[PDB]
């Protein structure tokens, strides 16, 4: 579909969706952004007072 010609665009997609989904079993599947804590910043918590260094790839916290 990407970088298709003018003739190929006429037959096929309805030109209403930009194509952000997946086709698994005939049903469209869309990912939802997951909010995650930053692993490249020093994190300080309370009760108890502590500072932790996150791990990038290997568990070296």
């Amino acid at each position: 579909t990407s970088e298709k010609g003018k003739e190929n665009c006429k037959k096929g997609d309805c030109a209403f969706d930009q194509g952000g989904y997946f086709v698994i079993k005939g049903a469209e599947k869309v990912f939802i952004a997951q909010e995650q804590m930053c692993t490249k910043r020093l994190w300080i918590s309370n009760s108890p007072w502590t500072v932790s260094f996150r791990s990038e790839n290997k568990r070296n916290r």
């Binding site: 006429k10 037959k11 997609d13 309805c14 030109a15």
Partner: protein
Amino acid sequence: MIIPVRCFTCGKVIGNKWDQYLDLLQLDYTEGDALDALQLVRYCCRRMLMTHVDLIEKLLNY
């Protein structure tokens, strides 16, 4: 989606004025002047002829 005929509000025949409206818009005419040139004194017909969207072209192409 072709132009809705009979102009549901107040019941005015506007089914044959879409081509003339497009021709007027093709020239150096604004929407108000083009609608006034079609002899429309009520704002219902002007709303009907201004809010319409041409969708049948995409249906034919796709």
